[PDB]
Design an enzyme around this catalytic site. Structure first.
Site, PDB file in Angstrom:
ATOM      1  CD  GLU A  64      -3.469  -0.582   0.732  1.00 28.33           C
ATOM      2  OE1 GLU A  64      -3.552   0.316  -0.114  1.00 28.33           O
ATOM      3  OE2 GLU A  64      -4.248  -0.967   1.377  1.00 28.33           O
ATOM      4  CG  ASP A  65       0.704   3.645  -2.315  1.00 30.13           C
ATOM      5  OD1 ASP A  65       1.141   3.547  -3.591  1.00 30.13           O
ATOM      6  OD2 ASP A  65      -0.434   3.849  -2.163  1.00 30.13           O
ATOM      7  CB  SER A  66       5.201   0.859   2.752  1.00 23.80           C
ATOM      8  OG  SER A  66       4.286   1.243   3.549  1.00 23.80           O
TER       9      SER A  66
END
Ligand SMILES: [Mg+2]
Ligand SMILES: [Zn+2]
Lengths: 71, 455, 358, 98, 148
Positions: free
Chosen positions: D63-65
């Site tokens: 999730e966009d980490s």
RNA sequence: CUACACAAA
């Protein structure tokens, strides 16, 4: 502001040959003749410098901007 | 107005004892746990009234003071009716019953987690504090499966966190506002959390019958290592020799046996749009769990996905409670991630490249679409476009062109002829429900088609 | 026997047959031969040893063996009034910290007293790092070709307390020693991954979830070792890594030997069906020790109920869990003998290092 | 990208040491992209040619980490100097600095 | 963020021994989830990685300006001619365990940008005391006012 | 405090 002392990715010391590479690259581009200069292959030059065929090391060697060339 | 007395000062409020920071992911945190940087844990305090039953536990906090963690910051004197900072409290060294000690936030404390805008009932939830003692970390770390409560992601989102210090607020945060109560949506009556992204595709990879290397089996050491970070009581492998091979379904059943459920549903992996192509393994296209035994089938978005009504976590919550469902989500996520630690998953530029034959086939499909459109244009030139009543010739022509330029459902044939479903990361993300859709693959590989704005 | 078999040591050398390289080195360094310190690529073949041990040795040589770097003491960077405004303390300290040094003495102290009296920009090099304390250097500890920085005209750069600091690479990457060059298993067959039907796979014909390779080829590059004493430096590095692993393992051997006394870093249970659970938590321990311990405990107890560890990135510790159908004394004896096997393996590795490099 | 390309750290000014700027970040190391565009003929490129592995590694990049190399951070990757300023006026003869 | 618009927050920092490495020792600076791609369609970043893999080996800097002719098949064949696989994928080993992944991993140089949003600037924590409004008696507003 | 501007989700 300079080519890093060691490769950012693996820590190989490309800064040992940073200066030699810069001046040898200017010389080698001069005999090979802004964008056409960037497409000149530096594989042989960097190999002769002793740097291995590592993606990270050659990337950081040839792409790092020199502050002295801009300031 | 929005910034007037009523709406700004009365219906809302500015509050003390609250923190805000960027949120990042932490796979090792439970779904009901939030990672709190230690610097914030020494800023926010918990008001502990000193009594006989807690004087011995509160003594280390008092002695540590503001110098070492866990410590305290203020002490309220009962017989003085005055607070005193601990740094200046060298001459007190005496805690009386009725004194209030303000100690640092420690691991296990309840905290309110909030993301704005707060649209859902789960937008404020209570997590157990896990204090990150690394001073270099200043983010609010949370499990990726907890993001569904707050509609959050880790692309720059910031979240408010405040630790209840009052006894009443702490009691009610623990008993009433804990995130186990928001596992089931108040809106849709279905589950909210589950496996997302890496864990959905990881569950599929772990539970799939065959890998490109053959049967999806692991030796006893790797089956054990799948449970290393599950953070629960590990199963028993004493009956397994090092030479023995365990299926992914066997270890999944070993995890799911703690909360036996009955589940029987086709996976997201099995789609009829891919059935003409591929070669669907018979043991992969029918997921069945009998009393916690994964008999057959892959586990993916339909079974373990977040917000999957009737999925395994919904059944676990129905039978054993939502807290057990959260623990099982964490355990299955650990299993999937530990599997992909060896399997590996990637997407490449070659994963989205058509073969020259498939490129020619897509070109032919697009040429046939443009041929139908040109036939409509030729009809328009001859005056052969006769609109129905209530439609103008322009509107009827527009409808004809919109229908003519629609991509046929056979546009997937060249895409799937160029794709190996066993090794294509992009296809596996799309088909298992982890991320992406069939229009995404078609746009990336075959063609965008007709751009529609307001239909 | 000889676990550490054939080693190939090949230093990286400047090829002066290249006209441009030679011309540049001559014009701006007056350098016609190889530099005093060269990167050395060591390729090692190991036979009959678990991949956990070879990879633990590699991890230690990368960022767990103690190393030396140049650092500036607080106040070493002289603010003054004519100092260059572009060569900030942070930038220059980052440049200096990552100069690879082969230092045999920690007492050495250097200074950088540079001044640009010309009208052009002057570049400070490592050759301007003048030793000001410690014994006079008979051999340089770093190459003189690094660009520490550049001085604007009329500006200066004075740093007075460039000293030698010790540490490990996981705490700070300036103590990183060995960069990875090659790692492969020689006893696992490989596919021809140049074909389209294998390019999405690793290449090995066995899944890593089932394979147990025992014959490995490990290649590591060391960044700066002296040109004449290459083999001595490589042998010292390898032996020091083996000793570091042995010492860290003995740190846990002591914990086992003190099991009757309830120490906080080892707890034991009596779960149920003759099974006892042993949980060993060691702060600031990495995957090297945890993986070595798990692998060798598993090799000792093939029928173990469960053995596993986890190094959570937070909590900064290794937690190893052992569950076995045995008594607490029996389990402790088995764990002790597995640790003794780890120690014997790395002692043999040290001995073979000595016999090979010579 | 048009939005993010303009908040990227880099050499925000070439005459930064002579400026007392507030909330300005000067990133030491900049690289030309290995695949450059014509925009870099007229403006300085801000950023680095990081080696990026597109892979699942423990589920820490969901999730966009992004998982970063601590060593890459330590070596100066995206390191720089943040600058703040403190301008305080003297009003009139009443106030003085001491 | 990358130049294709893929924002990311640094969630985990790993030491050099914990990071995955290819058979020839290449390891990443950033590990980017493959799930960021399929919905966002940022194929330009993927193609840039594929091109830069061969650019680094050839020691060149090529032009990737928009609307210039692009043939991803020829770029992949260029990767193959450089001595790599048709895809840029390589045999990778897990840094923490030393065990190779069963799947080849796509790894290469992707230009990345550090957006000037610093967590040290964005983070805020306030205690039970501070400046309050004179009128409403409520805390002041936000970090700038030292309470809120 | 009242604008206004630049940003984040
Ligand atoms: Mg977001
Ligand atoms: Zn490198």
């Amino acid at each position: 502001m300079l080519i890093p002392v060691v490769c950012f990715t693996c820590g190989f010391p490309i800064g040992t040959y940073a200066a030699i590479f810069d001046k040898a690259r200017t010389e080698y581009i001069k005999t090979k003749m802004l964008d056409a200069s960037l497409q000149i292959e530096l594989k042989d030059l960097i190999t002769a410098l002793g740097i291995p065929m590592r993606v990270c090391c050659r990337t950081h060697l040839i792409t790092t901007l020199d502050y002295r060339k801009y300031y | 107005r929005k910034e007037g007395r009523i709406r700004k000062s009365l219906l809302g409020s500015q509050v003390w004892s609250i923190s805000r920071s960027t949120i990042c992911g932490n796979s090792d945190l439970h779904l009901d746990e939030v990672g709190y940087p230690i610097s914030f844990a020494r800023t926010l305090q918990v008001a502990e009234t000193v009594q006989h039953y807690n004087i011995n536990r509160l003594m280390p906090y008092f002695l540590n003071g503001k110098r070492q963690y866990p410590g305290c910051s203020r002490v309220y004197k009962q017989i003085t009716q005055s607070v005193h900072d601990i740094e200046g409290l060298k001459q007190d060294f005496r805690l009386e019953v009725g004194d209030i000690l303000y100690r640092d936030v420690v691991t296990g404390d309840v905290a309110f987690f909030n993301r704005q805008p707060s649209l859902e009932r789960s937008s404020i939830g209570v997590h157990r504090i896990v204090v990150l003692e690394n001073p270099k970390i200043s983010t609010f770390q949370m499990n990726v499966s907890a993001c569904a409560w707050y509609n959050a992601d880790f692309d720059g989102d910031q979240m408010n966190l405040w630790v209840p210090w009052s006894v009443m607020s702490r009691v009610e945060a623990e008993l009433l506002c804990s995130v186990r109560n928001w596992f089931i949506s108040t809106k849709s009556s279905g589950p909210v959390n589950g496996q997302v992204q890496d864990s959905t595709v990881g569950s599929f990879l772990l539970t799939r019958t065959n890998t490109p290397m053959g049967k999806n089996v692991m030796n006893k050491l790797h089956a054990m290592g799948l449970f290393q970070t599950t953070q629960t009581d590990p199963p028993c492998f004493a009956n397994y020799s090092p030479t023995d091979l365990l299926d992914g379904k066997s270890v999944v059943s070993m995890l799911l046996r703690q909360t036996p459920i009955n589940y029987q549903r086709a996976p997201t992996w099995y789609s009829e749009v891919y059935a003409p192509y591929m070669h669907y393994n018979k043991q992969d296209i029918s997921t069945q769990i009998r009393n916690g035994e994964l008999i057959e089938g892959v586990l993916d978005k339909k079974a373990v996905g977040a917000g999957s009504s009737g999925g395994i976590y919904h059944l676990i919550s129905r039978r054993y409670g939502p807290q057990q469902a959260l623990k099982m989500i964490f355990a299955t996520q650990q299993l999937a991630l530990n599997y992909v630690r060896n399997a590996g998953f990637t997407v490449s530029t070659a994963d989205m490249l058509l073969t020259p034959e498939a490129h020619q086939e897509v070109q032919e499909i697009i040429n046939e679409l443009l041929l139908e459109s040109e036939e409509i244009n030729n009809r328009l030139l001859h005056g052969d476009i006769m609109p129905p009543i209530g439609l103008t010739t322009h509107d009827f022509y527009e409808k004809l062109q919109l229908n003519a330029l629609k991509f046929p459902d056979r546009i997937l044939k060249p895409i799937m002829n160029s794709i190996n479903p066993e090794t294509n990361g992009l296809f596996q993300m799309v088909a298992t429900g982890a991320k992406g859709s069939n229009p995404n693959m078609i746009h990336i590989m075959a063609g965008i088609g007709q751009i529609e704005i307001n239909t | 026997e000889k676990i550490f078999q054939n080693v190939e040591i090949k230093p990286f050398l400047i090829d002066f047959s290249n006209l441009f390289i030679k011309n540049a080195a001559k014009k701006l360094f007056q350098l016609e031969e190889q530099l005093p310190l060269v990167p050395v690529n060591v390729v090692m073949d190991f036979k009959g040893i678990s991949r956990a041990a070879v990879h633990g040795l590699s991890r230690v040589l990368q960022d767990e063996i103690p190393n030396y770097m140049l650092d500036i003491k607080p106040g070493g960077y002289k603010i003054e009034d004519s100092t260059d405004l572009f060569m900030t303390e942070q930038f220059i300290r980052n440049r200096i910290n990552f100069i690879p040094i082969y230092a045999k003495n920690e007492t050495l102290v250097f200074a950088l007293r540079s001044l640009n009296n010309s009208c052009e920009v002057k570049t400070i090099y490592s050759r301007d790092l003048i030793q000001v304390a410690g014994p006079k250097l008979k051999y340089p500890i770093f190459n003189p070709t690094f660009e520490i920085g550049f001085l604007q005209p009329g500006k200066s750069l004075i740093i007075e307390d460039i000293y030698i600091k010790k540490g490990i690479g996981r705490k700070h990457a300036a103590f990183n020693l060995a960069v990875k060059t090659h790692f492969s298993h020689l006893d696992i067959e490989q596919y021809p991954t140049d074909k389209k039907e294998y390019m999405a796979l690793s290449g090995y014909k066995q899944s890593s979830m089932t394979s147990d390779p025992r014959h490995h080829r490990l290649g590591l590059c060391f960044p700066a070792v002296p040109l004449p004493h290459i083999n001595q430096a490589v042998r010292t590095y390898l032996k020091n890594a083996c000793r570091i692993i042995i010492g860290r393992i003995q740190s846990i051997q002591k914990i086992y030997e003190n099991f009757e006394e309830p120490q906080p870093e080892l707890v034991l249970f009596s779960m149920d069906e003759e099974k006892t659970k042993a949980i060993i938590t060691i702060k600031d321990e990495t995957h090297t020790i945890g993986n070595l311990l798990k692998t060798y405990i598993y090799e000792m107890i093939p029928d173990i109920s469960f053995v596993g560890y986890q190094c959570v990135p937070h909590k900064q510790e290794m937690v190893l869990t052992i569950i076995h159908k045995a008594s607490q004394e029996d389990l402790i004896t088995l764990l002790e003998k597995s640790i003794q096997n780890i120690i014997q393996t790395f002692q043999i590795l040290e001995k073979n290092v000595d016999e090979l490099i010579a | 990208e048009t939005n993010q390309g303009r908040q990227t750290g880099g050499w925000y000014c070439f005459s930064w040491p002579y400026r007392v700027d507030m909330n300005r970040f000067f990133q030491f190391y900049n690289e030309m992209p290995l695949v450059k565009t014509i925009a870099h003929n007229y403006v300085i490129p801000n950023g680095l040619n990081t080696i990026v592995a597109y892979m699942i590694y423990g589920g820490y990049n969901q999730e966009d980490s992004v998982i970063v190399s601590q060593s890459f951070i330590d070596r100066g990757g995206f390191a720089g100097t943040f600058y703040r300023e403190e301008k305080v006026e003297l009003e009139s003869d009443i106030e003085s600095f001491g | 963020s990358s130049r294709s618009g893929n924002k990311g927050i640094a969630a985990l920092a790993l030491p050099t021994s914990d990071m995955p490495f290819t058979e020839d020792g290449l390891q990443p600076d950033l590990i980017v989830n493959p799930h960021s791609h399929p919905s966002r369609m940022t194929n330009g970043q993927m193609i840039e990685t594929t091109v830069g893999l061969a650019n680094a080996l050839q020691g060149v800097v090529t032009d990737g300006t928009a609307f210039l002719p692009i043939n991803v098949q020829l770029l992949s064949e260029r990767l193959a001619q450089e001595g790599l696989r048709f895809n840029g994928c390589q045999k990778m080993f897990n840094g923490q365990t030393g065990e190779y992944f069963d799947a080849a991993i796509f790894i290469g140089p992707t230009y990345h940008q550090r957006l000037q949003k610093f967590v040290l600037d964005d983070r805020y924590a306030v205690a039970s005391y501070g400046p309050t409004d004179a009128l409403t008696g409520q805390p002041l507003d936000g970090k700038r006012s030292h309470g809120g």
